């Protein structure tokens, strides 16, 4: 704030001061004034045409305005002017990173570190890049060094809170990191001189209904909607009123459509870009509990929560960690992910949901996967059929043997099916029905593939489509590869050597980490026929293809979150080893809810034993599969209604307390 | 090809999967193609060629991050794979990262020195940043490449670049006939009959039915040129169909054309060329106009199927199409003299003055009139405003010259105080006074040209760092239009005129040190060439007024840029070449009535530009002549242009109505 005042006087004193133009421009760029910022930077450059530092900071602004090509020309021009300019290289690399050119990002990060060898920001950024591709050279050094960089800075931390969970920090360190990010949001809002807000201490203006405001930049196609899209419309209108605050433009999707149609009030904060004016509106709506569903994730506008427009402010489901900030009062969680014992990682108090804070709209979005049929030469997972009108088709058939899983005998029906898969042709007609190839969903109905529409054909899923073997156990992990580390790959390799008849199924997420994974795998005595890769698939293909797997091996470091509920939905047991950080206790929470305590491992030996057991004790696997396949329907896991209602109980609980006392832990 | 028979015999045949995919992609079946490329890789997981071809297919579907992963994967499987390198580079070029474009094209060359497509592309990238190392080598090599390729049936030189290199005129038409024939072949796939064409004007109620086909109905120089046109056509005699090949981008340009054409048809919604051409035919179109040629967004497959009896190249592509499906090129006596009609595969159809037109009067009327400030120069401190007259009239002393001059007082001081302090706007006598550099913060639609601005705009030399006391030569085009000859020419000019600077644009910024260096190689210190940033459309035209003379690039002139400069009242020196692209500035100037600004050779050009920088009453005269004749000649007169454009349409039709093949119209 006072920097601005200074600089304008510096420019009052002296009209022609290139550095102070550039300095003014950088602080206007902090407080969001991108156009004005950009103007002063060109003044600086007009004064001094070889001002590398302006060009580099101009590029940053252009990147923030989403002018990516202009930011490119700016960074390059600063590197031309001064080829040993460390920041131009760091910044350049960060564009390459956001475009998914990680090899070219890594190169430019290196070049920075060579030029200015103590440059903490660029080290941590490179370290995340290395994580993304599963490059683990000097891995132990790296980790030891990131703890170091952070140790130092604490006395702004160069490791992002959404990253801090992947590295061996202390929980004091992870909290501390989030604490200095939350603090930075306050320093942004205090510029606005805003008086404190006067909060309802009553429900009388609201007609006896609790006003709950849900803020998310992901009401649209993003994992957030894929999990909670039915929550607003399932709220009880008699006792609650729902306000949805989108932080992003309408992305066009049926996910966005649902939330706008179903909420009682939908407010687009993307056109109220000023945080003061936007937090004014939240207060004017009269919100009682305002829920944060971003934490430190792409889109967040935590400044809205930094100004305090609601008496109660809660974190929920979009952020797998602490915000570290005193403007957030609760975190909605459960005892199985955030045990009372470990409450002191979290700056916020702990609000317990009764089973798992995690939800999924799979019940609603993929209901063609509630029931299945298989084709013969019996295996539940080699050649699979799913359809809304599957039953009708089965009953159109001469012969079918229900074991309850219907089974199609190998006839001229099953020949035309498997030859479709064989040719890679899109679809066929049998008895007037659509029989469609699972590899071709986007061709047939795009919105079906994205999960915007339930599919309206019968879809065929086979291991042959993925190059999975028809006579061997399949392990999968379907996450982004960044969550695999050395230890984890070691565990999987162990399992793979005890179970000779097996393949571990991974994805090119990204494909540029595949050679690494396989290299490191082969250092552990594992041939290249053993780990299979296939590409990332459009949403519905993903969830469907989990049917081909036998068992899914969860990443202990950071669990499948969305990816977890995805695999459970296909009827595939997941083996997890819950760690310490909330991101490592999720798959375990989901399984406690689902009711498979048998799949939750206490340590590595336990983990590997569980999964080797599952891959050799075949009837134990038929037992466990059977148990998961029924319990996804019969347990609270996928039950958005039970979820919403119990969530409603927890909110009233939070109101009653504030109605009297200050925020305190919830059971 | 039924490779689908080949895969019938053998299911797990990776190569035919990759090949079917590459042929499905020919036809445009991208989702299907993409499907067979993942199959190819399911079978053979280190199949480089499929990963790289995959990339092409996802780059088409505009998944750029997807393409990158496919390219860089082809390079990790095989660091010696050149094709993958050339492709990787090509995406860098499209991201505007020209250095990486270059570093990557050379790797493709080092790996594979017989690589025509990657040499020619590298030459373009080099052209873009004005890197002229081994220029003559490069130039002679580019001909040899095409001589060789033309002799064995598809040039590695894009027809749109052909104007930029020393190719022959026979060679130009041939590169154009190739990309044209390629539109014909991609269409014969569909086996469609010839269409049955109208023969009189009877279905249409006596109206000629014109269809203007473009991808540039939006924030684009095409629309900055011809947006008024459809609305000025005579409903009694003409029925106007505008065929977009771009989704609606939300701009006013699109709104305007949508409101004023009689029929606006959004062909971006109909991706099939068969289905799209059938539509054009049933609208009963008599003349279908090609506004793209070989430019970004072309869908010339549309013109390849002949849905209309007369088909004319108009305004957007400054070259011949080489295509026998294009009947006339609308141009003029000065741009394409009949003497030199051999380049043109099309017959010549003449406009009376220029084929060139410009919507500047409608777009930028706040520049018809101007005020200056004192201590008399017309271009040191300038004011422009719809309400200038009233603003002036609110002032105590104003001296008229017709050019108002504000003397030096508290009023004149407060303006200068704003420019010095870089602040956004002020108020004098209640009138709104703005900084030329602050326009996107005042009104973003006024900045693009979508709206006439509503406050008064002050524009200065100090804003762009120009001398208050020296002559200013400008050129405002993208840097790729300059060549050695040209930069030599201007340097000559600049040494003859000690009080002068050449004012240049960062277009792209990374080209500035090249130009700076080659200049020094003959010229003077880094104070002779001033670089300014690329500007918002409006600031861009507006600030042109600060200059004394514009020096036009002979290799390819300002087209839109030519118009842009003249609209500010800045004279333009030009030397017409032999390609249409190098003649345009001279034709515009002929219409304006300034033939004394057209050079016959390099020497004349230097003499013209020197006289304008040293003779300062002759300067006042030609600046006067321009400032006036841009209103009174037919150059920026859209209504007159429209009418004679209508006259040439009828003249074109009546020839065909007599049962004739296309012939020259004069």
């Amino acid at each position: 704030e006072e920097a601005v005042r200074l600089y304008r006087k510096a420019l009052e004193v002296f009209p022609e001061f290139a550095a102070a133009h550039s300095n003014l421009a950088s602080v206007l760029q902090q407080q969001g004034k991108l156009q004005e910022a950009l103007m002063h930077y060109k003044e600086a450059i007009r004064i001094s045409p070889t001002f590398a530092d302006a060009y580099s900071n101009m590029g940053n602004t252009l990147k923030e305005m989403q002018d990516v090509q202009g930011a490119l020309q700016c960074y390059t021009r600063a590197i031309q002017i001064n080829p040993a300019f460390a920041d131009a290289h760091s910044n350049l690399a960060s564009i390459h990173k956001d475009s998914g050119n990680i090899p070219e990002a890594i190169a430019s990060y290196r070049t920075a570190l060579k030029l200015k060898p103590d440059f903490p920001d660029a080290y941590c950024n490179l370290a995340h890049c290395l994580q993304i591709v599963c490059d683990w050279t000097d891995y132990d050094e790296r980790m030891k060094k990131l703890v170091s960089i952070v140790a130092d800075q604490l006395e702004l931390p160069s490791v992002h809170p959404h990253h801090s969970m992947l590295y061996p920090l202390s929980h004091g360190f992870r909290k501390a990191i989030a604490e200095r990010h939350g603090n930075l949001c306050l320093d942004k809002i205090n510029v606005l001189h805003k008086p404190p807000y006067e909060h309802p201490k009553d429900l009388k203006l609201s007609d006896g209904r609790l006003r709950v405001g849900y803020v998310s930049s992901d009401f649209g196609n993003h994992p957030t909607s894929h999990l909670m899209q039915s929550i607003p419309g399932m709220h009880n209108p008699d006792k609650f009123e729902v306000f949805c605050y989108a932080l992003s433009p309408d992305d066009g999707t049926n996910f966005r459509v649902k939330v706008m149609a179903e909420a009682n009030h939908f407010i687009d904060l993307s056109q109220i870009p000023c945080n003061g004016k936007a937090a004014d509106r939240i207060h004017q709506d009269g919100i009682h509990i305002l829920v944060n569903m971003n934490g430190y994730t792409k889109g967040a506008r935590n400044e809205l929560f930094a100004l305090r427009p609601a008496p109660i402010q809660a974190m929920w489901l979009g952020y797998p960690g602490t915000s570290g900030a005193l403007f957030m009062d609760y975190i909605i969680t459960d005892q199985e992910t955030s045990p009372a014992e470990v409450a002191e990682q979290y700056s916020e108090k702990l609000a317990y949901m009764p089973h798992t804070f995690f939800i999924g709209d799979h019940a609603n979005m993929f209901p063609h996967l509630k029931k299945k049929a298989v084709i013969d030469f019996i295996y539940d997972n080699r050649i699979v059929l799913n359809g809304i009108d599957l039953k009708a088709f089965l009953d159109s058939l001469p012969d079918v043997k229900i074991v309850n899983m219907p089974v199609i005998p190998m006839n001229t029906i099953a020949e035309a099916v498997i030859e479709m898969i064989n040719r890679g042709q899109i679809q066929i007609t049998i008895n007037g029905f659509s029989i469609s190839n699972g590899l071709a969903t986007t061709q047939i109905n795009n919105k079906a593939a994205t999960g915007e529409e339930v599919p309206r054909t019968i879809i065929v899923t086979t291991r042959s489509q993925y190059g999975l073997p028809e006579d061997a156990i399949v392990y999968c992990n379907f996450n982004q590869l960044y969550k695999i580390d050395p230890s984890t790959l070691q565990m999987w390799a162990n399992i793979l050597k005890r179970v000779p008849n097996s393949v571990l199924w991974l994805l090119r997420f990204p494909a540029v980490g595949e050679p690494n994974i396989q290299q490191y795998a082969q250092n552990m005595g594992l041939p290249q026929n053993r780990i299979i890769f296939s590409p990332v698939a459009p949403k519905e293909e993903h969830v469907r293809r989990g049917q081909l797997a036998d068992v899914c091996l969860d990443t202990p470091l950071c669990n499948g979150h969305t990816t977890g509920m995805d695999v459970l939905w296909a009827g595939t047991p997941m083996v997890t080893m819950p760690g310490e950080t909330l991101a490592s206790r999720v798959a375990a929470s989901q399984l406690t809810c689902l009711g498979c305590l048998e799949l939750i491992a206490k340590n590595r030996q336990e983990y590997e034993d569980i999964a080797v057991k599952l891959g050799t004790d075949l009837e134990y696997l038929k037992k466990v599969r059977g148990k998961v396949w029924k319990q996804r329907i019969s347990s609270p896991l996928f039950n958005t209604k039970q979820y919403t209602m119990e969530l409603e109980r927890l909110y009233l609980q939070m109101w009653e307390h504030y109605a009297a006392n200050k925020p305190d832990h919830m059971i | 090809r039924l490779y689908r028979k080949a895969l019938e015999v053998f299911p797990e045949f990776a190569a035919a999967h990759s090949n079917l995919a590459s042929v499905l992609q020919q036809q445009g079946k991208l989702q299907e193609a993409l499907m067979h490329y993942k199959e190819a890789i399911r079978i053979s997981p280190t199949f480089a060629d499929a990963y790289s071809n995959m990339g092409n297919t996802l780059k088409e579907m505009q998944d750029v991050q997807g393409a990158l992963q496919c390219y860089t994967r082809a390079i990790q499987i095989n660091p010696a794979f050149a094709d993958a390198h050339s492709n990787l580079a090509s995406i860098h070029k499209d991201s505007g990262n020209i250095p990486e474009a270059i570093a990557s094209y050379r790797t493709a060359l080092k790996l594979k020195p017989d690589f025509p497509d990657a040499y020619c592309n590298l030459a373009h990238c080099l052209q873009i940043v004005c890197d002229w190392t081994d220029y003559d080598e490069r130039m002679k090599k580019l001909v040899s490449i095409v001589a060789d390729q033309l002799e064995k049936n598809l040039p590695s030189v894009h027809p749109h670049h052909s104007m930029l290199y020393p190719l022959s005129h026979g060679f130009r038409k041939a590169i154009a006939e190739r990309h044209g024939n390629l539109c014909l072949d991609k269409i014969n796939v569909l086996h469609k009959p010839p269409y049955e064409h109208p023969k009189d004007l009877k279905l249409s109620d006596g109206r000629l039915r014109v269809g203007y086909v473009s991808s540039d109905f939006g924030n684009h120089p095409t629309s900055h040129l011809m947006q008024s046109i459809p609305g000025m056509h005579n409903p009694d005699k003409f029925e106007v169909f505008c065929y977009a090949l771009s989704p609606d981008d939300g701009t006013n340009f699109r709104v305007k054309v949508m409101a004023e054409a009689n029929h606006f048809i959004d062909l971006s919604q109909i991706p099939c060329n068969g289905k799209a051409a059938d539509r054009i035919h049933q609208d009963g179109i008599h003349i279908l106009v090609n506004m793209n040629g070989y430019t970004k967004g072309a869908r010339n497959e549309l013109f390849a199927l002949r849905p209309a009896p007369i088909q004319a190249m108009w305004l957007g592509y400054p070259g011949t199409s080489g295509a026998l499906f294009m009947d006339y090129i609308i141009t003029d006596q000065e741009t394409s003299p009949a003497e030199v009609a051999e380049q043109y595969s099309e017959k010549l159809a003449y406009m009376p003055h220029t084929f060139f037109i410009g919507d500047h009067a409608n777009m930028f009327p706040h520049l018809k009139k101007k005020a200056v400030i004192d201590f008399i120069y017309d271009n040191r401190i300038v004011l422009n405003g719809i309400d200038l007259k009233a603003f002036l009239d609110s002032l105590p002393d104003v001296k008229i010259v017709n050019m108002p001059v504000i003397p030096m007082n508290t009023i004149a001081e407060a303006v200068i105080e704003m420019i010095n302090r870089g602040q956004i706007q002020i108020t004098i006598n209640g009138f709104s006074i703005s900084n030329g550099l602050a326009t996107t913060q005042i009104n973003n639609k006024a900045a693009t040209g979508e709206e006439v601005p509503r406050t008064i705009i002050v524009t200065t030399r100090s804003q762009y760092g120009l001398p208050e006391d020296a002559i200013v030569y400008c050129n405002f085009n993208q840097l790729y239009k300059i060549d050695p000859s040209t930069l030599q020419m201007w340097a000559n000019i600049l040494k003859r005129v000690p009080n002068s600077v050449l004012w240049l644009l960062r277009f792209p910024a990374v080209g500035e040190p090249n130009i700076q260096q080659y200049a020094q190689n003959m010229g003077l210190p880094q104070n002779r060439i001033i670089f300014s940033p690329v500007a918002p459309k409006e600031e861009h035209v507006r600030r042109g007024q600060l200059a004394d003379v514009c020096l036009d690039t002979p290799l390819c002139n300002g087209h839109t840029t030519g118009m842009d400069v003249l609209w500010a009242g800045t004279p333009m020196v030009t030397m017409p070449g032999e390609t249409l692209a190098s003649r345009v500035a001279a034709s515009q100037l002929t219409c304006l009535g300034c033939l004394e600004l057209i050079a016959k050779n390099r020497q004349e050009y230097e003499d013209i530009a020197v006289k304008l920088g040293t003779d300062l009453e002759y300067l006042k005269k030609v600046r006067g002549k321009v400032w006036k004749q841009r209103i009174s000649s037919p150059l920026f007169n859209t209504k007159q242009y429209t009418m004679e454009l209508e006259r040439l349409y009828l003249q074109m039709w009546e020839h065909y109505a007599a049962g004739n093949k296309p012939d020259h119209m004069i």
Binding site: D218, P223, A537 | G66
Partner: peptide, 12 residues
């Protein structure tokens, strides 16, 4: 994913 986009949770 290759052809479409696969949205994910990522840092700001």
């Amino acid at each position: 994913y290759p052809g479409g986009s696969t949205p994910v949770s990522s840092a700001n």
